[PDB]
Amino acid sequence: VDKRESYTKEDLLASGRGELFGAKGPQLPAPNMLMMDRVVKMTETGGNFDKGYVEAELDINPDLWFFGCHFIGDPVMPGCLGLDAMWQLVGFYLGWLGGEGKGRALGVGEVKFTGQVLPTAKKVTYRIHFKRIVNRRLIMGLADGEVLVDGRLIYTASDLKVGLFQDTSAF
Amino acid sequence: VDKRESYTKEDLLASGRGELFGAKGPQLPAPNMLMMDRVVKMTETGGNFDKGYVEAELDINPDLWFFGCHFIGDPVMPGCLGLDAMWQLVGFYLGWLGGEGKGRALGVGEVKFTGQVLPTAKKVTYRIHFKRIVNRRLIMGLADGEVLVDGRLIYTASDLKVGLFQDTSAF
Numbered sequence: 450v451d452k453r454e455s456y457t458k459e460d461l462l463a464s465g466r467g468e469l470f471g472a473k474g475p476q477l478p479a480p481n482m483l484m485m486d487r488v489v490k491m492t493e494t495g496g497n498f499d500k501g502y503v504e505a506e507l508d509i510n511p512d513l514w515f516f517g518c519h520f521i522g523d524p525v526m527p528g529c530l531g532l533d534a535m536w537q538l539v540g541f542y543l544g545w546l547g548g549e550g551k552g553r554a555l556g557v558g559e560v561k562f563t564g565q566v567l568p569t570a571k572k573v574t575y576r577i578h579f580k581r582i583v584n585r586r587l588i589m590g591l592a593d594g595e596v597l598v599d600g601r602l603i604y605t606a607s608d609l610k611v612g613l614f615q616d617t618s619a620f
Numbered sequence: 621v622d623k624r625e626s627y628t629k630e631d632l633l634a635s636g637r638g639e640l641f642g643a644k645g646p647q648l649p650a651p652n653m654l655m656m657d658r659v660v661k662m663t664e665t666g667g668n669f670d671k672g673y674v675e676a677e678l679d680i681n682p683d684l685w686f687f688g689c690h691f692i693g694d695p696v697m698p699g700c701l702g703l704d705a706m707w708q709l710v711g712f713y714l715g716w717l718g719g720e721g722k723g724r725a726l727g728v729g730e731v732k733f734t735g736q737v738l739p740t741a742k743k744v745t746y747r748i749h750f751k752r753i754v755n756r757r758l759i760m761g762l763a764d765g766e767v768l769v770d771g772r773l774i775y776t777a778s779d780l781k782v783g784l785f786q787d788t789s790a791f
């Protein structure tokens with residue numbers, strides 16, 4: 450794949466249909482599971498471990514679907530969805546490096562939610578710091594993640610793990 | 621609250637509206653974020669640590685919203701939603717014990733996904749084992765959770781943490 454440092458919302462939507470990295474590359478979820486609007490920076494070096502970095506953003510507005518049901522009369526973006534965005538970015542990066550296969554989240558170490566995303570916020574920022582990448586027969590990524598809302602850190606996740614699989618018959 | 625050992629779909633829908641545990645108890649998310657169809661068992665003793673146990677189920681059918689977008693052409697229930705159902709059950713239990721306040725997931729320690737939920741599955745079972753409950757004027761619940769698909773253990777989550785809050789304007 451020809452690597453770009455950033456991707457637009459249109460690119461992320463093309464990705465969900467497998468039109469970005471080709472038919473062998475991984476796909477990002479499509480709405481309403483897509484949890485980012487754009488990827489503002491992607492590098493092979495950099496990040497807290499100098500092994501890779503990804504920064505993405507999600508624009509917030511009061512009308513996003515999840516505010517209406519989580520919860521009724523007490524809108525707050527589900528934490529699980531910010532967490533999924535992080536898994537999505539780790540998997541996307543693996544595909545960006547040329548990894549082939551279907552994306553499947555494998556797990557995460559500690560996750561801490563210290564703040565919330567309200568319908569009055571404006572922008573959610575995701576930062577992924579890669580600590581390890583296996584791109585041999587097996588394609589797997591390990592990273593730490595940070596979620597900020599309007600420049601303030603609210604969630605951290607250690608050891609997000611995602612792999613790409615050509616055969617998912619054993620799951 | 622007048623504890624019942626089990627709750628039906630209609631009870632969970634009333635919960636999302638704030639009718640089940642009253643105006644001061646926690647609310648479950650409403651569809652499309654409600655991740656269970658019923659709670660089959662709730663006991664304050666029992667469970668792996670004999671400090672509480674809850675078992676719930678989610679009926680699976682190909683038409684569930686998430687199957688159409690995650691991923692297009694490769695349907696699999698998002699692992700993040702299975703995690704949310706477990707946080708949802710921990711908070712529901714704190715309200716069941718009589719706790720007052722709005723539920724907020726605080727984090728989780730370690731999550732491992734070893735299997736997937738396909739649209740061909742029939743049922744997902746959630747089993748929550750409580751470790752510690754602080755129901756003082758600081759309501760928090762700590763528990764380990766397991767997710768099974770048609771009886772097969774596929775996800776384990778250690779140290780799920782949820783708390784109920786009177787005032788959430790601090791986050």
Ligand SMILES: */C(=C/C(=O)SCCNC(C)=O)CCCCCCC
Pocket residue numbers: 475476477478533536537539540541552553554555611620690696697698699733734735736737
């Ligand atoms: C959507 C679904 C899952 O990953 S379900 C995880 C099941 N795990 C196993 C081992 O079967 C989340 C997709 C995140 C990764 C997207 C990569 C582009």
Ligand SMILES: */C(=C/C(=O)SCCNC(C)=O)CCCCCCC
Pocket residue numbers: 519525526527528562563564565566646647648649704707708709710711712723724725726782791
């Ligand atoms: C929906 C939203 C969240 O919990 S967002 C977490 C934000 N964290 C803080 C500290 O503000 C999930 C609700 C799960 C618990 C429901 C209990 C009934």
